[PDB]
Design a protein around this ligand. Structure first.
Ligand SMILES: CCCCCCCCCCCCCCCCCC(=O)OC[C@H](COP(=O)([O-])OCC(O)COP(=O)([O-])OC[C@@H](COC(=O)CCCCCCCCCCCCCCCCC)OC(=O)CCCCCCCCCCCCCCCCC)OC(=O)CCCCCCCCCCCCCCCCC
Ligand SMILES: CCCCCCCCCCCCCCCCCC(=O)OC[C@H](COP(=O)([O-])OCC(O)COP(=O)([O-])OC[C@@H](COC(=O)CCCCCCCCCCCCCCCCC)OC(=O)CCCCCCCCCCCCCCCCC)OC(=O)CCCCCCCCCCCCCCCCC
Ligand SMILES: CCCCCCCCCCCCCCCCCC(=O)OC[C@H](COP(=O)([O-])OCC(O)COP(=O)([O-])OC[C@@H](COC(=O)CCCCCCCCCCCCCCCCC)OC(=O)CCCCCCCCCCCCCCCCC)OC(=O)CCCCCCCCCCCCCCCCC
Ligand SMILES: CCCCCCCCCCCCCCCCCC(=O)OC[C@H](COP(=O)([O-])OCC(O)COP(=O)([O-])OC[C@@H](COC(=O)CCCCCCCCCCCCCCCCC)OC(=O)CCCCCCCCCCCCCCCCC)OC(=O)CCCCCCCCCCCCCCCCC
Ligand code: HEA
Ligand code: HEA
Ligand SMILES: CCCCCCCC/C=C\CCCCCCCC(=O)OC[C@H](COP(=O)(O)OCCN)OC(=O)CCCCCCCCCCCCCCC
Ligand SMILES: CCCCCCCCCCCCCCCC(=O)O
Ligand SMILES: CCCCCCCCCCCCCCCC(=O)O
Ligand SMILES: [Cu+2]
Lengths: 145, 552, 139, 76, 186, 220, 67
């Protein structure tokens, strides 16, 4: 009873079957591919060496920023053992949230470091680049447990 | 509600993910990929042989080759290009997209599939491994005429390997055909009757019937030839009717072969046209009947290859080839009608299909010109014939195969091939091809027969050979963009996170996830026509599809 | 199945017509009489299509309607349990290797290689046929 | 053990599963040098040295590609 | 679901048709080179002993009925009748091929050879391939019996038995054709 | 078995030969198959000699040192492996060759080297029966001696890891039975069979690997 | 016909044609969206990227900073 914007159709299962016109894409990420790849292996190999999902958020936080960040953290598959990094380029605000299960592993000694590195890299206009730096430092900080 | 994703899908895959799955596999998708890759390797080998031939044929005089080496070159070129690249690519496309199109989880016999693939590969490797013999590979023609392939003439050890490799490959092809017929007949979705399945599937069924009719007789002829070579079996002596017997048997095999490698690509292009024309396929049942007619007629024209022997009944075969010329015409007109008054967009598959149309029309015109005996009395065994069958072969296999690759790459990978590289590739191929093979009509009309390694400067036709070799080198350079595009776009390249990346699709394969799961389906739609995915993605269109389906 | 049988009957009719016409047109008007090499191929391709069509016809007459042959039907009709489709197996590549050994032993006239190839083909085919029927080991 | 990760090699704590990469790189270079020097004492022919140089060039190209891709972080 | 028309049956039928085309090629080889040799086209050193060609044909024809009785006992779920009938069929097929080998020996003894004549070539090449098909059928019989021995009897075994049975029927009738062409028409 | 094959097959018919005389020779001069590698190494080693003051170092010296190096590297392997891996504990349970990819690859490389050396010893027989040039076989051996071992190493490593992954897949899920169903909303599943306990919704709980082989066919 | 110029054409025409066709086609714009530059506002939909690595709502800490 939703809109299904001109091509989507709900199947006999819950799956949606979307389409695309011959001359467009289906991602629309305003970043180059060769930086998406770098952010991806950062996010994967740093999560291997720390036993904790690392996430990244870029949308707006038009409220109490920490409230909204911990509202968002409930969307990671295992939020209790996860580390999220939120960024709002309009409000120019950085927010790092933890989980209850990931703590006592050297996290708060590393969150301000990551925030400072992300800010120092953002002050020139490098979004993906600062995200990479912050993920690197926080993943190198947290210990496996 | 937000929903977690990845910045970019994974590029390659874990270590040890493929090599053992490659040996024990039984799913048709991996086997189709293997088919395609090895067939393109063999295509590259054959093309290299052709480039050697061209660079010798320019500049009168034997610069770096010999007569023996030239004969081996054109023999192996013809053999590889016809039997180790086209006949298996047919089954490659079949194994790729037939079970998806009929809505089945697998092929009928899943281990016979792998058996067929491995038989093909090892037979090809056996037949090619005659070049490491000090005497060389087979040196007779591709056709292996009657007393020249005896034991007295052609005594080397390359002809034996030739014969045995062909036998093994033929066994593999017969098994593949059996599997395809059984799959199309038995395993089918619970809603679709046989007059709702796509045209590609019908062409594959008919081609499999032709394979079953044609290949066993070739195996019989080859066993007779091997008996004659290794036991002195007096089967093909000219003292008996041994010279014309071989020709009758071989051509009864060999014309159904060209129609076998022609029909499924007609299917491919007929399946690509409506997606980019935004229209239904014009004359469904008409196309089915034309396919059946071509199939029935293809076995009773075998002797239009033996006009110059003076030993056949000319009016019969001449008239019946004139007859087989018609259904191809109705097929062509149905394609043009499907493109008529639509909304055309020229992405790479549509571009390659239009190129196919043009090239095949010219080739078929030259062929129907060739079909009259008093004209074949002059142009046979010349370069006119070479230009003709190169037009038809190229325009069909090469162009329709590139179209099929650019069309079904996402449905098998989840990525998208680049389009600028695709356009560059198409234009290079088109220009080089039409510049390498056009002057050969004139080159062969004036006396220059096929299979000559040298000629004299006092003769004419020394500039036309230079133009042809320039074109051949352009065609050779035209393959770098394609392999670069495939090498880059398989790992990187814009991912596909939806069904049907070419909107307005049909055929029930664009109704499942872009890389299909194992067993190909998580749910099926209700089937009412031959465009089920189109009616699934645009439910507000069935009233208009049923209302105005008969204006014309 | 009703349409497959009709297809094969059409093909058999045309092939028989062509065979008879060719035979009687080369009995006269030809250099040496009946041609004897295309005639045979034509009668026996007629026989091929005839065998297949007759089998399909019998199976169709001995069968009730099927969700595939039937229009008007829905996906809840075919709900059930299909046959047995073999998962992973490695015997095909060994069969192909054995057959290739026998073939290369027949190309170069080497009888010992032909014997070895035939033995390997028998062994590999036995392995393929018995793969899903060997019981647990007896200890 | 010296160390690899279990998602790469599932049985990493049951047996030796890692060999350093410098061994493989320098071994490839040494084998290429052996192929190149194997054409000393040219015995009346040059069909063989074409093959020698081709195989050596292919080996060097593979080693160079691997080294360059590892140096830029495209592999691990 | 299971779409009652069996799958193995369709596969075996289409493959049998292809093999018929193979034998078509062999027949076409034989008929040419018979229109060439004029007069006594079987050369003088050959004489086809009919006193031994008929018994083997009759034992093959009887083996057909034996195989049919076997598949009859198979379609109802009892294996021992199948085993008995198929052992009988195997025995008499072996006897047929042994008699054929004996005729080959006595024919080459004082006459035709493959490199000696054209008739000898076409004769040996038309009958030896049929002999090879018979030997393949015997191997199939042995394999099927072992498979029935090694596990429980289910419908799949019945399907295997049926398809082997009518493959053997095919080889039998094609032999009937070969024999009627070679020995009686001449 | 030994009696049968000593009665039915002929070996070393010395009477077809003659007594030894330093002036006559024949064409097949091979030793038994356990010295063929020594002969092949002597055949495919290039002619590198050194001539300095009043002396000469011929080519077969190379064969001598290579032979000695092989015979010295064979008995000293366990100490090399324990020095390189650094594992000095007692062991009474064996390893499956698929759990130790590096050692399996080393062994496969050594076996490939041995096979190349052994086939390079029957040059004459191979080039005569299979129609190949003799110089071609010499160069094929001389190049294979360098490019076949590493290729075999690479393939064996990847193959071992593939086998490990195939084991982990049947540990996580159950044994594939090969039966297909259609699931009235047109879905195809394949009816796995669990090896242990099951959870609330029918999926089996994954097991842990214990170094023992796992069944792959339902009839076993 | 003047062996030098035959070799010259055969070696030069294909590569020249490749050059013109590449400069014609490979210098256009792809369908990829052009990079986002932080001087200007952010209009794209919200983005959430997970790690996916370890297979299978009480907060433990936090931090902040505003550039
Ligand atoms: C409509 C669809 C279109 C279809 C395709 C279009 C057709 C266009 C033509 C193709 C154009 C160019 C192709 C470029 C390839 C693209 C590369 C890519 O990124 O794709 C990766 C892509 C991703 O693979 P993956 O499963 O996701 O994970 C790979 C793992 O990371 C790693 O897996 P692993 O660790 O288990 O090992 C895999 C191993 C595989 O090893 C082999 O295959 C060895 C044999 C190949 C070379 C033999 C030549 C001698 O790979 C390697 O050996 C490493 C490098 C390859 C060596 C090549 C030497 C270069 C000189 O691979 C494929 O999917 C390819 C599918 C099948 C291809 C192989 C088919 C071979 C058939 C049988 C071979 C047996 C021959 C025996 C005779 C000779 C004895 C050796
Ligand atoms: C000439 C070339 C001969 C081609 C061989 C015949 C191909 C037949 C394909 C048609 C149907 C395909 C099929 O049923 O799949 C079975 C199976 C495919 O397994 P799948 O794909 O997993 O599907 C399983 C089915 O659902 C269910 O399959 P299933 O497990 O229920 O088994 C069905 C049945 C298979 O049903 C049959 O097709 C019986 C046909 C009688 C075999 C007669 C062939 C002898 C050739 C004449 C020699 C010249 O299996 C049997 O009952 C035992 C068959 C014994 C085969 C004997 C071959 C001996 C050849 C050695 C010759 C040496 C002597 C000459 C010197 O393929 C085979 O077992 C046939 C062996 C092919 C090896 C190629 C030989 C080279
Ligand atoms: C040029 C060739 C040179 C010939 C050399 C000399 C020939 C002598 C034969 C070789 C060794 C003879 C074996 C003596 C044992 C016989 C006693 C017996 O019946 O034990 C049953 C025995 C069951 O053993 P089990 O301990 O109870 O394990 C049962 C499990 O289900 C185990 O089940 P599974 O899942 O682990 O797999 C079972 C596997 C087990 O069978 C084998 O592994 C035997 C092959 C091992 C040789 C070493 C491989 C080296 C390759 C590298 O067999 C297969 O995979 C199927 C292959 C078909 C074998 C029979 C075909 C005979 C071809 C005749 C031509 O099954 C067999 O071994 C039968 C193989 C021999 C057939 C009977 C003899 C007939 C000889 C010719 C007749 C004319
Ligand atoms: C952005 C991309 C685009 C860029 C464009 C181009 C960029 C550069 C251009 C430069 C020129 C390019 C030319 C090459 C083209 C590349 C194409 C290619 O490779 O395939 C793409 C691609 C290559 O993958 P990749 O991205 O390079 O990733 C590689 C691995 O992921 C990760 O590799 P890995 O870290 O795992 O390293 C593996 C390798 C390391 O990589 C290498 O360095 C390669 C070295 C090659 C030669 C080395 C031989 C060593 C010999 C020494 C002798 C013994 C010492 O290690 C080995 O296994 C080599 C074996 C050496 C064993 C030696 C161990 C000795 C032990 C002690 C022995 C001491 C005693 C001696 C006694 C001797 C006799 C007993 O293929 C695939 O991904 C999968 C292919 C799937 C199917 C395709 C097959 C189609 C076949 C058609 C038929
Ligand atoms: C893959 C394909 C392929 C195809 C499709 C064809 C198609 C045809 N071929 Fe060709 N042919 C070969 C491959 C192919 N051929 C090969 C490989 C050889 C020789 C090889 C060898 O000898 O070594 C060969 C040789 C060959 C010969 C003998 C050459 C000889 O002298 O040696 C002849 C004529 O007898 C012939 C005829 C035809 C005809 C009549 C068609 C017809 O199918 C085509 C009809 C097509 C049309 C496009 C008509 C278009 C229709 C309309 C537009 C309506 C127009 C109506 C009128 C003009 C009436 N072919
Ligand atoms: C399906 C088939 C097919 C295809 C695609 C081709 C492709 C080509 N053919 Fe071929 N040809 C035949 C089928 C085919 N041919 C047949 C049947 C005959 C006659 C048979 C005979 O007489 O017996 C024949 C004969 C034939 C001749 C004349 C032989 C004779 O003298 O009579 C010539 C050249 O004039 C020729 C040219 C070409 C050219 C230039 C291509 C170009 O299309 C190919 C361009 C290809 C490439 C250059 C490959 C690219 C290669 C490189 C990139 C090298 C890279 C190398 C490695 C990586 C290994 N063909
Ligand atoms: C090809 C198969 C063709 C026919 C098969 C049927 C065999 C028919 C058997 C009857 C033979 C006969 O009776 O002919 C008597 C002659 C007297 O010739 P001779 O000179 O005077 O004697 C001096 C002898 N040196 O011997 C012969 O030719 C010897 C006959 C050779 C045996 C047949 C070969 C079988 C090999 C099978 C191939 C398998 C390869 C598979 C790989 C894909
Ligand atoms: C790398 C594999 C090579 C495949 C086969 C290549 C064949 C080369 C042929 C040239 C060698 C010499 C031929 C005979 C002598 C001349 O004259
Ligand atoms: C280890 C390889 C050493 C190669 C040395 C080559 C010596 C050449 C002698 C001349 O003289
Ligand atoms: Cu001709």
């Amino acid at each position: 009873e939703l809109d299904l914007p001109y091509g989507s159709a709900l199947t006999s299962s819950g799956r949606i079957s979307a389409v695309t016109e011959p001359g467009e894409l289906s991602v629309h990420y305003p970043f180059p591919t060769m930086d998406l790849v770098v952010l991806d292996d950062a996010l994967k190999y740093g999560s291997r060496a720390a036993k904790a999902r690392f996430a990244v958020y870029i949308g707006p936080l038009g409220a109490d920023t920490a409230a909204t960040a911990r509202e968002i953290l409930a969307n990671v598959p295992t939020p209790e053992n996860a580390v999220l990094l939120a960024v709002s380029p309009d409000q120019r605000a950085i927010e790092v949230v933890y989980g209850a299960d990931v703590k006592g592993r050297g996290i708060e000694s590393a969150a301000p470091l990551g925030v400072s590195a992300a800010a120092a890299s953002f002050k020139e206009g490098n979004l993906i680049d600062g995200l990479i730096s912050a993920v690197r430092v926080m993943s190198a900080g947290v210990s496996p447990a | 509600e937000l929903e977690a994703r990845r910045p970019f899908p994974e590029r390659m895959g874990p270590k040890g993910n493929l090599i053992y799955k490659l040996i024990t596999t039984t799913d048709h998708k991996l086997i189709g990929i293997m088919y395609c890759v090895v067939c393109f390797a063999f295509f590259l080998v054959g093309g290299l042989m052709a480039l050697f031939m061209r660079t010798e044929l320019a500049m009168p005089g034997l610069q770096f080759l010999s007569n023996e080496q030239f004969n081996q070159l054109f023999t192996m070129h013809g053999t590889v290009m016809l039997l180790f690249y086209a006949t298996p690519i047919v089954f490659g496309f079949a194994n790729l997209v037939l079970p998806l199109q009929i809505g089945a989880p697998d092929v009928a016999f899943p281990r016979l599939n792998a058996l067929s693939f491995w038989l093909f590969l090892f037979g090809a490797l056996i037949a090619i491994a005659g070049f490491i013999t000090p005497g060389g590979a087979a040196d007779f023609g591709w056709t292996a005429y009657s007393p020249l392939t005896d034991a007295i003439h052609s005594p080397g050890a390359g002809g034996d390997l030739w014969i045995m490799g062909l036998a093994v490959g033929g066994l593999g092809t017969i098994l593949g055909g059996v599997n395809m017929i059984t799959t199309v007949v038995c395993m089918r979705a619970p809603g679709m009757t046989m007059f709702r399945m796509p045209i590609f599937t019908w062409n594959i069924l008919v081609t499999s019937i032709l394979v079953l009719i044609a290949f066993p007789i070739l195996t019989a002829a080859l066993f007779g030839l091997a008996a004659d070579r290794h036991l002195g079996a007096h089967i093909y002596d000219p003292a008996n009717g041994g010279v014309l017997l071989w020709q009758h048997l071989f051509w009864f095999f060999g014309h159904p072969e060209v129609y076998i490698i022609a029909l499924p690509f007609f299917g491919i292009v007929s399946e690509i046209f409506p997606v980019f024309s935004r229209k239904p396929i014009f004359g469904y049942t008409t196309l089915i009947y034309a396919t059946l007619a071509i199939a029935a007629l293809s076995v009773a024209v075998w002797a239009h290859h033996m006009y110059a022997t003076g030993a056949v009944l000319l009016p019969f075969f001449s008239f019946m080839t004139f007859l087989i010329a018609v259904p191809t015409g109705i097929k062509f007109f149905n394609w043009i009608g499907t493109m008529w008054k639509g909304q055309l967009t020229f992405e790479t598959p549509m571009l390659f299909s239009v190129g196919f149309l043009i090239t095949f029309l010219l080739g078929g015109l030259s062929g129907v010109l060739l079909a009259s005996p008093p004209l074949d009395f002059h142009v046979t065994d010349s370069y006119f014939v070479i230009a003709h069958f190169h037009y038809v072969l190229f325009g069909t296999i090469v162009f329709a195969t590139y179209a099929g690759i650019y069309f079904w790459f996402p449905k098998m990978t989840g990525r998208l091939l680049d389009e600028r590289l695709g356009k560059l590739h198409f234009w290079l191929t088109f220009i080089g091809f039409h510049t390498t093979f056009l002057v050969q009509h004139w080159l062969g009309d004036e006396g220059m027969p096929r299979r000559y390694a040298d000629y004299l400067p006092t003769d004419g036709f020394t500039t036309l050979n230079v133009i042809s070799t320039v074109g051949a080198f352009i065609l050779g350079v035209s393959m770098l963009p394609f392999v670069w595009n495939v090498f880059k776009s398989w790992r990187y390249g814009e991912p596909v996170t939806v069904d049907d990346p070419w909107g307005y699709g049909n055929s029930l394969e664009w109704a499942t996830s872009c890389p299909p799961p194992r067993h190909n389906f998580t749910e099926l739609p209700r089937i009412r026509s031959e465009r089920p995915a189109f009616e699934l993605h645009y439910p507000h269109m069935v009233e208009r599809m049923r209302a105005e389906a008969h204006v014309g | 199945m009703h349409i497959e049988a009709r297809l094969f009957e059409i093909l058999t009719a045309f092939f028989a017509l062509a065979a008879v016409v060719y035979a009687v047109l080369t009995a006269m008007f030809a250099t040496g009489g009946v041609e004897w090499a295309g005639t045979t191929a034509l009668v026996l391709t007629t026989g091929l299509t005839l065998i297949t069509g007759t089998f399909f016809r019998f199976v169709a007459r001995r069968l009730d309607t099927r969700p595939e042959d039937y229009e008007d039907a829905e996906i809840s009709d075919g709900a059930g349990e299909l046959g047995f489709f073999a998962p992973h197996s490695w015997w095909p590549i060994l069969i192909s290797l054995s057959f290739s050994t026998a073939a290369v032993g027949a190309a170069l006239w080497l009888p010992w290689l032909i014997a070895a190839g035939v033995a390997f083909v028998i062994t590999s085919v036995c392995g393929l046929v018995f793969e899903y029927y060997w019981g647990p080991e007896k200890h | 053990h010296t160390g690899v990760d279990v998602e790469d090699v599932p049985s990493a704590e049951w047996g030796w599963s890692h060999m350093p990469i410098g061994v493989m790189h320098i071994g490839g270079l040494l084998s290429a040098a052996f192929l190149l020097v194997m054409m000393r004492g040219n015995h009346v022919g040059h069909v063989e040295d074409w093959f020698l140089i081709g195989f050596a060039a292919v080996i060097v190209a593979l080693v160079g590609r691997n080294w360059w891709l590892r140096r830029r972080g495209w592999i691990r | 679901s299971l779409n009652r028309p069996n799958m193995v049956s369709v596969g075996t039928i289409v493959w049998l048709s292809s093999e018929l085309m193979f034998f078509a090629g062999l027949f076409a080889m034989y008929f040419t080179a018979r229109a060439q040799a004029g007069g006594a086209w079987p050369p003088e050193p050959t004489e086809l002993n009919l006193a031994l060609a008929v018994p083997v044909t009759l034992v093959l024809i009887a083996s057909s009925f034996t195989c049919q009785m076997g598949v009859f006992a198979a379609e109802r779920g009892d294996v021992f009748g199948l085993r008995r009938w198929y052992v009988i069929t195997f025995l008499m097929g072996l006897f047929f091929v042994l008699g054929q080998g004996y005729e080959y020996i006595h024919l080459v003894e004082h006459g035709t050879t493959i490199p000696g004549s054209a008739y000898g070539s076409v004769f040996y090449l038309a009958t030896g391939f049929h002999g090879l098909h018979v030997i393949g059928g015997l191997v199939a019989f042995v394999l099927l019996l072992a498979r029935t021995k090694m596990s429980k009897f289910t419908p799949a075994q019945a399907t295997a038995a049926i398809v082997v049975s009518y493959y053997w029927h095919f080889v039998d009738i094609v032999w009937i054709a070969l024999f009627a062409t070679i020995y009686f028409v001449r | 078995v030994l009696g049968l094959m000593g009665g039915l097959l002929q070996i070393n018919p010395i009477w077809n030969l003659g007594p030894y005389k330093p002036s006559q020779v024949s064409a097949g001069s091979q030793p038994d198959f356990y010295m063929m590698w020594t002969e092949g190494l002597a055949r495919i080693w290039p002619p590198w000699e050194f001539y300095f003051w009043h002396h000469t170092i011929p080519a077969p010296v190379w064969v001598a040192v290579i032979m000695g190096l092989v015979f010295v590297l064979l008995p000293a392997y366990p100490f090399l492996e324990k020095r390189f891996t650094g594992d000095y504990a007692h062991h009474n349970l064996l390893q499956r060759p698929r759990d130790v990819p590096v050692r399996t690859a080393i062994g496969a490389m050594a076996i490939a080297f041995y096979m190349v050396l052994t086939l390079a010893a029957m040059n004459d027989i191979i080039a005569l029966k299979f129609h190949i040039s003799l110089n071609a076989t010499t160069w094929i051996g001389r190049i294979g001696m360098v490019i076949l071992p590493p290729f075999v190493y690479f393939i064996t490593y990847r193959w071992c890891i593939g086998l490990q992954r195939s084991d982990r897949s049947v540990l996580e899920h159950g044994v594939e039975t090969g039966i297909i169903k259609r699931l009235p909303h047109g879905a195809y599943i394949e009816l796995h069979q669990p090896l242990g306990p099951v959870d609330e919704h029918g999926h089996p709980i994954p097991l842990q690997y214990q170094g023992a082989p796992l069944p792959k066919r339902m009839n076993k | 016909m003047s062996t030098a110029l035959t070799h010259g054409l055969i070696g030069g025409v294909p590569l020249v044609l490749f050059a013109v066709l590449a400069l014609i086609f490979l210098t256009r714009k792809g369908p990829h969206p052009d990079t986002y530059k932080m001087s200007d506002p952010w209009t794209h939909a919200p983005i959430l990227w997970a790690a996916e690595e370890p297979r299978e709502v009480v907060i433990g800490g936090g931090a902040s900073g505003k550039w």
